Amino acid sequence: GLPVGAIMNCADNSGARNLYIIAVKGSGSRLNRLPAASLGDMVMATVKKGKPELRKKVMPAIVVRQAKSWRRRDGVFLYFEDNAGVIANPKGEMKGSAITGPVGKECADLWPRVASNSGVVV
Amino acid sequence: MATRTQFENSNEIGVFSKLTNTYCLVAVGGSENFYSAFEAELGDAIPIVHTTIAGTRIIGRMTAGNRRGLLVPTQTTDQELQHLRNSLPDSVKIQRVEERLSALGNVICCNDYVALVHPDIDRETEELISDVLGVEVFRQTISGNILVGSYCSLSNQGGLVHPQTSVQDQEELSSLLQVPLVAGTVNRGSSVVGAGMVVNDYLAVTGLDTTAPELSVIESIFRLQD
Amino acid sequence: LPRKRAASIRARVKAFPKDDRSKPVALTSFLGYKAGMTTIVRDLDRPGSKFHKREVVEAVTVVDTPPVVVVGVVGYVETPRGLRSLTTVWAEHLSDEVKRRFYKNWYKSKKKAFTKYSAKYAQDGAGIERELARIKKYASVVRVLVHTQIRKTPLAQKKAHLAEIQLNGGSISEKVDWAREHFEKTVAVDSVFEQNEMIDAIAVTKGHRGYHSRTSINHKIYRVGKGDDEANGATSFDRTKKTITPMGGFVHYGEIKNDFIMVKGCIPGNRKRIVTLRKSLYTNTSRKALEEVSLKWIDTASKFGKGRFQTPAEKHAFMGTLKK
Amino acid sequence: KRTPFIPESVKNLKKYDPEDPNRRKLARDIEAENGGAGVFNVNLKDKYLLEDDEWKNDIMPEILDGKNVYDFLDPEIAAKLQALEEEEEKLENEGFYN
Amino acid sequence: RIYQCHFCSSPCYPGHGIMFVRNDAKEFRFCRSKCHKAFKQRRNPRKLKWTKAFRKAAGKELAVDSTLTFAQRRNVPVRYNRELVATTLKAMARIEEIRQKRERAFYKNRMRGNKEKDFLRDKKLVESN
RNA sequence: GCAUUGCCGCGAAGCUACCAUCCGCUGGAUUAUGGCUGAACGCCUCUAAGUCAGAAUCCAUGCUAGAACGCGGUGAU
Ligand SMILES: [Zn+2]
C-alpha cells in the first residue's frame, strides 16, 4: 500500500517519529511502475523527525500497519488504522523492545523477532 | 539435558513452541524434524500438540499458560479451539481472552505459582490469569521492558532474564518470584531469552547458536543436571 | 497465432486421452453448460506450504450438467491417409431437439429427418446388425454419438447439441455392444467423472477479439452435485438444507435443477455456453492433482447486487416480519 | 510452598537412543515410510483423546441455517430446552397465539 | 465463523464485507460498502432507520427472548461429544421456529390497536355534527 | 434556459486490471561450443571406444486454423 516516497509511523520505542521510505527491497522491475511496500515488507526508510541521530540515515524497516484493504487467505478484507513500520537490522532482529499498536499477523509470521517484540498482534 | 534444536533454519524457539510441565505445543509448518526433536525429548510422557492459533505457526508468543491452564487470545478460531480441547486433557484449562492485544507469550510470563504480566494490562485478564492458571499475579517490568515473557523465562526451577536487568531489579523481582535469577544471553547475543528458549522443570530447549557458556548458565540456574 | 474466429460455437475436441483397455467401457468427455461463478471456503491440505490446515477461499465455476443420452455410434478405421469413418449407426427414436439440429426450418418443415431409418428397425435389424458386426470386425477406434437434455435446462434454444466421444474402455465389440444397450438411454457424469478429477475445458471464449476455441487444462473438480439433492449447497460443516442455486439464481442464466460440476478456477467462455469437459490427457501427479479437497462452506448469495443472505429463511429470520 | 513439577511418566520414560535397532519411532520415522519431508501429510484426528475413537473420525459442524453451531453447543442443552418448551406450552394455553 | 455486521448486525461471511482495525485492535466488520462508507462518515446507526440499531432501539421487533439464551460465544471449549451435536441441530431449528413465531405474534399485537384508535377517531368525525 | 455525466449520498450492469483470479515450468534426436575417462606416443589429450551438457536445427506430442477447386460417414429428397 506504500510506494517509494511514503511517510509511515514508528511503532517501536527507539525514538523515531516517522519513517520515509526511499527504496523497497525485493521488488520487481517493470517500466513506469512503483515499488510498493505492504504488510510484512522490509524496505529502506529514512527518519524525517525525531532524534537527529536516527535522522539523516536510512535504516531497514518492516511494515506492521498498512491501512489499505488486502485479501487475507481466509475470506476477509481488512486494513489497519494507519501506516506504520518498525526499524531494525537487515537480520530482522528488532531495535525496539516493545512494539506498540497492532502488528499484522502475516508480518509476525514472517519475522520471529518482530513477533518476539510484538505486544499487539492484529 | 539441555538440547539445541532448530526450526526451519531459525534459532528462535519460544516463537513457534509453547512448553509447560504437562504438555507442549508445536507448529504444523515446514517439517516434522522439529516435532521429532521434541519426541526424542518428551516422548509419551506429556502430550505434544500440533496447533495453529488463528492460522499461525507462531504459538508460544500467542499463548500463555501453566500446567493447570492455558490462555488463548480472542482471535483463536473454534475449530482450532475444539482441537485444542479434544487434544489436551481435563487437567489443562483452555479459555479465549477478550482483550486488546493478542500476543500472550510476550505479555504473560508465569510458572505454576507466580505470573508476571504487562503492567498496563486490563483488569479482566488480570482476573482471568489468577483464576485459570491459579497463580499469583504481579504487574512488573523486567528492567523497564514492558514485554515480560520474551525478556524473562520462568519455571518452578528458577528464572532467566535478559542482560540489561539490574541486579537490584533481579532481587526486587526474585523476592516476588522466590526463585533465583541470572542475567543471561541466548542464541549468541540475543537478549530475547523467552522466545530464544523454552523451559519446564526438567527440560530447557534452545537454539543451535546458544553457546556453551549460555548453556552452562541455563544448566546452572534451571538445574538441568540432577 | 492468427486470431480468426471460431468455426462452431461448440468447440472441437482435437485430442482424446489414451486408451486403456484394461478399464471398463466408459466415456472420456462430456458437454455441459456453464451457469456462473461463486466462492468456496475449504481447508488446504498442503504440507510444504504455510497455508497447510488453513481455511482458503476459492473461486469456482459451476457448469450445469443435464444427463447426456447416447443415440448413435461411429467407428473409424485406419487408412494410410488417416482416420475415416466407414459408417455411422443411429438409434431409432430421436427427439425433436436432435431432429431440430439437422434442420434449419424446423418450424415449417415436414420433419422428415429419420423416417426411413426407422424402417431399419421395422426389420429384424439385419442391415443394422450387419453394420454393428462390421464395426466389431473393422473400425479400430470407436466414437459414440451423444446429445444433451436441453429441455431440462434454462437455455432458450430448444435445439440440443450432438457430439462424438472417443470411448477408451476395452474391447471394440464390447464397446459397440455397450453403446447398443446405451442407445436412447442416459448417462450421468457420476459414472464418468468423479470428485478431485483434474479435467480440461474446451470452450469458445467470449466474443465482443474473442470467440476463439480455447483448451484450459488441469482443473480439479470440486463437486459432482446430484440433481435430486436439496443439500447441493451443503457441506458436513454447512448443515443448511440449500441448493447450489444462488440467491435469485445464476445471473443471466437461470437455475440448476439438474446435476452440476463445480470445478476449480476459471474457464474460457461465458455463461449460457456449450462447454466440453474432458478428462486429462495424462495422469497428472503434481500433488496439485492428487489433492483430495474437503469443502467447508458454499456462497449462494446474490450476484445481482451486494448479497447479504444465503437462504431466504435466513433472510426472514434476520429481518423478522415486514409490513407486507 | 512451591515445588518443581516433574511427573513420574517423565522420569519413567527411557532416554531416546539415536543409534538403536529397537527404539521408539519419532515423527521422522513414520514420515520417511510414505515419502519424505514435504510430501508427508500430518494426521491430527487420530491422535487426540476422546470418549470414543469413532468420534475421532466424526465431524464438528460449523453453520446451521445461517447460524454458527459453536455458539449453540453447550453442556446440558436439554434442561434449558425443556424449560423453554414449558414456557411455550404456557404461551400456548394462555391463548396468546391466534 | 459467522460474525455480525458492525453497522447492519447482518451475518458477515468469508468474502463478504470490509474490516476496519483501529489502533486499539478492535476489529469492525461491515457486510457491504454502504455500511463501510456509513462508518467512514462517523454516522450513527441509531439515526439510520433500516439498520438494526434503530429497529432494536425502536421496538419494531422484540429484542429479548428466552430463546436467545442459547446463542452465545463460549471461550472455554467443550470436548467433542457426537451425541450432543444432533441435539444442538434440533435445538437451532426448533428455537429459530419459536423465535419467528414469537416475532410474528409480537407484531400481531401492533395491528389490533389501530382498530381501537380508528374507532375513537371516527367517533370524533361523527359526534360533532 | 443552463452547468461537456451540474454536484453529492448510496448503488447496479458491462468493459477492464498480478489492481482481481485461474491455467499453462510438452518430450526425444541434433550443430557449434564446453568437458570426462582414455590410449594411440610410458609426458600429454573432450575422441580413437564410450559419454555429459548444449542452437531458434529436425521429429514426436498438445494447442490454434482447416485445402474457400481436400476427403469421408450419415439423413431426407
Ligand atoms: Zn452491513
Swiss-Prot record, chain A:
Keywords linked to the UniProt accession: Acetylation, Cytoplasm, Methylation, Ribonucleoprotein, Ribosomal protein
Pfam families: Ribosomal_L14
Biological process, per Gene Ontology: cytoplasmic translation
Recorded GO MF terms: large ribosomal subunit rRNA binding; structural constituent of ribosome
InterPro entries: Ribosomal_uL14 (IPR000218), Ribosomal_uL14_CS (IPR019972), Ribosomal_uL14_sf (IPR036853)
Its job: Component of the ribosome, a large ribonucleoprotein complex responsible for the synthesis of proteins in the cell. The small ribosomal subunit (SSU) binds messenger RNAs (mRNAs) and translates the encoded message by selecting cognate aminoacyl-transfer RNA (tRNA) molecules. The large subunit (LSU) contains the ribosomal catalytic site termed the peptidyl transferase center (PTC), which catalyzes the formation of peptide bonds, thereby polymerizing the amino acids delivered by tRNAs into a polypeptide chain.
Annotated PANTHER family: 50S/60S RIBOSOMAL PROTEIN L14/L23, LARGE RIBOSOMAL SUBUNIT PROTEIN UL14
UniProt-recorded name of the protein: Large ribosomal subunit protein uL14A
Organism: Saccharomyces cerevisiae (strain ATCC 204508 / S288c) (Baker's yeast)
Name of the gene this protein is made from: RPL23A
From Swiss-Prot, chain B:
Record bears the keyword Phosphoprotein: yes
Record's keyword terms, sorted: Cytoplasm, Initiation factor, Nucleus, Phosphoprotein, Protein biosynthesis, Ribosome biogenesis
Family matches, as Pfam families: eIF-6
Domain of life of the organism encoding this protein: Eukaryota
Gene3D superfamilies cross-referenced by the UniProt entry: L-arginine/glycine Amidinotransferase, Chain A (3.75.10.10)
Example GO molecular function: translation initiation factor activity
GO annotation (BP), single: maturation of LSU-rRNA from tricistronic rRNA transcript (SSU-rRNA, 5.8S rRNA, LSU-rRNA)
GO CC term (a single one): preribosome, large subunit precursor
Location(s), subcellular: Cytoplasm; Nucleus, Nucleolus
Post-translation changes: Phosphorylation at Ser-174 and Ser-175 promotes nuclear export.
Chain positions found as Phosphoserine: 174-175
Record has Cytoplasm as a keyword: yes
InterPro entries: eIF6
Miscellaneous note of the record: Present with 18600 molecules/cell in log phase SD medium.
Quaternary structure and partners: Monomer. Associates with the 60S ribosomal subunit.
Listed HAMAP family: eIF_6
Family of this protein: Belongs to the eIF-6 family.
Function: Binds to the 60S ribosomal subunit and prevents its association with the 40S ribosomal subunit to form the 80S initiation complex in the cytoplasm. Is also involved in ribosome biogenesis. Associates with pre-60S subunits in the nucleus and is involved in its nuclear export. Cytoplasmic release of TIF6 from 60S subunits and nuclear relocalization is promoted by the GTPase RIA1/EFL1 and by SDO1. Also required for pre-rRNA processing.
Name of the featured protein: Eukaryotic translation initiation factor 6
Gene: TIF6
Curated annotation (Swiss-Prot), chain C:
Alphabetic keyword roster: Cytoplasm, Isopeptide bond, Methylation, Phosphoprotein, Ribonucleoprotein, Ribosomal protein, Ubl conjugation
Source superkingdom: Eukaryota
Protein localization: Cytoplasm
GO function term, MF aspect, one: RNA binding
Disruption phenotype: A mutant confers resistance to trichodermin, a trichotecene toxin produced by plant-pathogenic fungi.
GO BP term, example: rRNA processing
Residue numbers of Phosphoserine PTMs: 8, 140, 236
Modification sites for Phosphothreonine: 87
Main localization (coarse): cytoplasm
Residues that span the membrane, as ranges: none
Cellular component terms per the entry's GO annotation: cytoplasm; cytosol; cytosolic large ribosomal subunit
Cross-link (Glycyl lysine isopeptide (Lys-Gly) (interchain with G-Cter in ubiquitin)) at residue(s): 23, 120
InterPro entries in the record: L3_arc_euk, Ribosomal_L3_dom_3_arc_sf, Ribosomal_uL3, Ribosomal_uL3_CS, Transl_B-barrel_sf
Description of how the protein assembles with itself and partners: Component of the large ribosomal subunit (LSU). Mature yeast ribosomes consist of a small (40S) and a large (60S) subunit. The 40S small subunit contains 1 molecule of ribosomal RNA (18S rRNA) and 33 different proteins (encoded by 57 genes). The large 60S subunit contains 3 rRNA molecules (25S, 5.8S and 5S rRNA) and 46 different proteins (encoded by 81 genes). uL3 forms together with ES39L one of the contact sites for the signal recognition particle that targets ribosomes to the endoplasmic reticulum membrane.
PANTHER family, per database record: 60S RIBOSOMAL PROTEIN L3-RELATED (PTHR11363), LARGE RIBOSOMAL SUBUNIT PROTEIN UL3 (PTHR11363:SF5)
Stated family: Belongs to the universal ribosomal protein uL3 family.
Note: Present with 450 molecules/cell in log phase SD medium.
Protein name: Large ribosomal subunit protein uL3
Species lineage: Eukaryota, Fungi, Dikarya, Ascomycota, Saccharomycotina
UniProtKB/Swiss-Prot annotation, chain D:
Subcellular location: Nucleus, Nucleolus
First and last residue of the signal peptide: none
Family membership: Belongs to the TRAFAC class OBG-HflX-like GTPase superfamily. OBG GTPase family. NOG subfamily.
Function (record text): Involved in the biogenesis of the 60S ribosomal subunit.
Subunit structure, as described in the record: Associated with nucleolar and cytoplasmic pre-60S particles. Directly interacts with RLP24.
Note in the entry: Present with 28000 molecules/cell in log phase SD medium.
Protein name: Nucleolar GTP-binding protein 1
First and last residues shown, out of full length: 373 to 470 of 647
